[PDB]
Design an enzyme around this catalytic site. Sequence first.
Site, PDB file in Angstrom:
ATOM      1  CG  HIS A 234      70.187  53.511  51.716  1.00  0.00           C
ATOM      2  ND1 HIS A 234      70.920  53.027  50.689  1.00  0.00           N
ATOM      3  CD2 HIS A 234      70.528  52.763  52.822  1.00  0.00           C
ATOM      4  CE1 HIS A 234      71.733  52.052  51.124  1.00  0.00           C
ATOM      5  NE2 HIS A 234      71.474  51.874  52.441  1.00  0.00           N
TER       6      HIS A 234
ATOM      7  CG  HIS B  32      61.417  56.564  54.344  1.00  0.00           C
ATOM      8  ND1 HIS B  32      60.729  55.636  55.136  1.00  0.00           N
ATOM      9  CD2 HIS B  32      61.261  56.133  53.071  1.00  0.00           C
ATOM     10  CE1 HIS B  32      60.172  54.723  54.343  1.00  0.00           C
ATOM     11  NE2 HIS B  32      60.527  54.990  53.092  1.00  0.00           N
TER      12      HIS B  32
ATOM     13  CG  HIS C 209      61.396  56.480  48.275  1.00  0.00           C
ATOM     14  ND1 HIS C 209      62.360  55.554  48.360  1.00  0.00           N
ATOM     15  CD2 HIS C 209      60.486  56.155  49.279  1.00  0.00           C
ATOM     16  CE1 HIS C 209      62.049  54.656  49.356  1.00  0.00           C
ATOM     17  NE2 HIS C 209      60.943  55.028  49.960  1.00  0.00           N
TER      18      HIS C 209
ATOM     19  CD  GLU D 118      60.195  53.629  46.609  1.00  0.00           C
ATOM     20  OE1 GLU D 118      59.595  53.248  47.633  1.00  0.00           O
ATOM     21  OE2 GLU D 118      61.359  53.246  46.341  1.00  0.00           O
TER      22      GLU D 118
ATOM     23  CG  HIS E  47      56.987  55.425  51.583  1.00  0.00           C
ATOM     24  ND1 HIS E  47      57.980  54.775  50.866  1.00  0.00           N
ATOM     25  CD2 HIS E  47      55.919  55.609  50.760  1.00  0.00           C
ATOM     26  CE1 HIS E  47      57.512  54.569  49.620  1.00  0.00           C
ATOM     27  NE2 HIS E  47      56.293  55.098  49.518  1.00  0.00           N
TER      28      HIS E  47
ATOM     29  CB  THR F 189      60.184  50.125  48.161  1.00  0.00           C
ATOM     30  OG1 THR F 189      60.637  51.199  48.924  1.00  0.00           O
ATOM     31  CG2 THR F 189      58.649  50.012  48.080  1.00  0.00           C
TER      32      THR F 189
HETATM   33  N1  LIG Z   1      59.799  52.196  51.470  1.00  0.00           N
HETATM   34  S1  LIG Z   1      59.550  51.390  52.714  1.00  0.00           S
HETATM   35  O1  LIG Z   1      58.559  52.018  53.548  1.00  0.00           O
HETATM   36  O2  LIG Z   1      59.407  50.010  52.401  1.00  0.00           O
HETATM   37  C1  LIG Z   1      61.079  51.520  53.679  1.00  0.00           C
HETATM   38  C2  LIG Z   1      62.233  52.064  53.254  1.00  0.00           C
HETATM   39  F1  LIG Z   1      62.413  52.585  52.001  1.00  0.00           F
HETATM   40  C3  LIG Z   1      63.329  52.239  54.032  1.00  0.00           C
HETATM   41  F2  LIG Z   1      64.457  52.755  53.558  1.00  0.00           F
HETATM   42  C4  LIG Z   1      63.293  51.745  55.345  1.00  0.00           C
HETATM   43  S2  LIG Z   1      64.872  51.817  56.219  1.00  0.00           S
HETATM   44  O3  LIG Z   1      65.524  53.092  55.989  1.00  0.00           O
HETATM   45  O4  LIG Z   1      64.610  51.538  57.615  1.00  0.00           O
HETATM   46  C5  LIG Z   1      66.166  50.756  55.511  1.00  0.00           C
HETATM   47  C6  LIG Z   1      65.891  49.267  55.538  1.00  0.00           C
HETATM   48  O5  LIG Z   1      64.940  48.775  54.598  1.00  0.00           O
HETATM   49  C7  LIG Z   1      62.131  51.189  55.876  1.00  0.00           C
HETATM   50  N2  LIG Z   1      62.027  50.782  57.226  1.00  0.00           N
HETATM   51  C8  LIG Z   1      61.258  49.677  57.823  1.00  0.00           C
HETATM   52  C9  LIG Z   1      61.878  48.436  57.260  1.00  0.00           C
HETATM   53  C10 LIG Z   1      63.150  47.969  57.919  1.00  0.00           C
HETATM   54  C11 LIG Z   1      62.827  46.801  58.943  1.00  0.00           C
HETATM   55  C12 LIG Z   1      62.111  47.130  60.322  1.00  0.00           C
HETATM   56  C13 LIG Z   1      60.614  47.503  60.190  1.00  0.00           C
HETATM   57  C14 LIG Z   1      60.242  49.019  60.132  1.00  0.00           C
HETATM   58  C15 LIG Z   1      61.190  49.858  59.341  1.00  0.00           C
HETATM   59  C16 LIG Z   1      61.029  51.078  55.001  1.00  0.00           C
HETATM   60  F3  LIG Z   1      59.868  50.563  55.500  1.00  0.00           F
HETATM   61 ZN   LIG Z   2      59.832  54.136  51.364  1.00  0.00          ZN
END
Ligand SMILES: NS(=O)(=O)c1c(F)c(F)c(S(=O)(=O)CCO)c(NC2CCCCCCC2)c1F
Ligand SMILES: [Zn+2]
Length: 257
Positions: A61, A91, A93, A103, A116, A195
């Site tokens: 992703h 990470h 976008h 976003e 982010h 997101t």
């Molecule tokens: N944009 S965002 O900050 O809301 C976002 C992501 F886009 C994203 F891709 C991730 S991910 O790679 O880990 C894929 C799952 O959504 C997280 N990670 C958080 C959310 C996942 C649950 C655990 C809490 C902290 C990590 C995530 F927080």
């Molecule tokens: Zn993000």
Amino acid sequence: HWGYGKHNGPEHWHKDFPIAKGERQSPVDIDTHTAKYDPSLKPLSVSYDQATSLRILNNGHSFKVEFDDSQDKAVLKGGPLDGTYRLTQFHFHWGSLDGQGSEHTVDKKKYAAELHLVHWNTKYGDAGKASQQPDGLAVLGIFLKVGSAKPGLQKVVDVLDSIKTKGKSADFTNFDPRGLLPESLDYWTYPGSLTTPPLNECVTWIVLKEPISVSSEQVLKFRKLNFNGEGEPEELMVDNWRPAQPLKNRQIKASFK
Ligand SMILES: NS(=O)(=O)c1c(F)c(F)c(S(=O)(=O)CCO)c(NC2CCCCCCC2)c1F
Ligand SMILES: [Zn+2]
């Protein structure tokens, strides 16, 4: 099974994650004229001096740099937040072209990309548990525009050729996330969500007003990454952004006038 494509992208996510149509979904358009300046908001405290980066991974992703979050080493507090949030990962976008990729939007303006930095509230002990709570996470969002290079980003862009396809990872130590921040910590804040699936409504969003500049060459390397696993048809990892969602009853607060 979700992604960003025509048959599995943001317009489909509600079927597996009905919270997609909830009352505090992110991202949002930030209408800067209706945001409320709140003189009672604190300066954001960002304490990243002892941060310990560990690894970088392509998860199909985005890509994400994970940190040692087993100690109080890289923490966010103050601003709108109560208590202490520990950095777990960052990470990005980004777009297929420079006029899209962020976003959040600002008065409908899209940026080329958005960074982010994801933090979890230490009163919940662990990032997964925190993600189940309404005040579990704080995500610091920073816009990227294309212009002069950001020297602090180069260490990240230079190892992306080692994680081209989904599931690849590499050790990635001694990365200082302070080199990704703009001068000002002026920000907008509002209650929202992840997101990406599972779209939990657990995030306090803190979005900086000042973009960083990155170069065309830096963002071109993001666009060389692949959504697919090695040995599936090649689909370039681009346009991995969820569009703005309805603000519903929410107020966006500004830390600045
Ligand atoms: N944009 S965002 O900050 O809301 C976002 C992501 F886009 C994203 F891709 C991730 S991910 O790679 O880990 C894929 C799952 O959504 C997280 N990670 C958080 C959310 C996942 C649950 C655990 C809490 C902290 C990590 C995530 F927080
Ligand atoms: Zn993000």
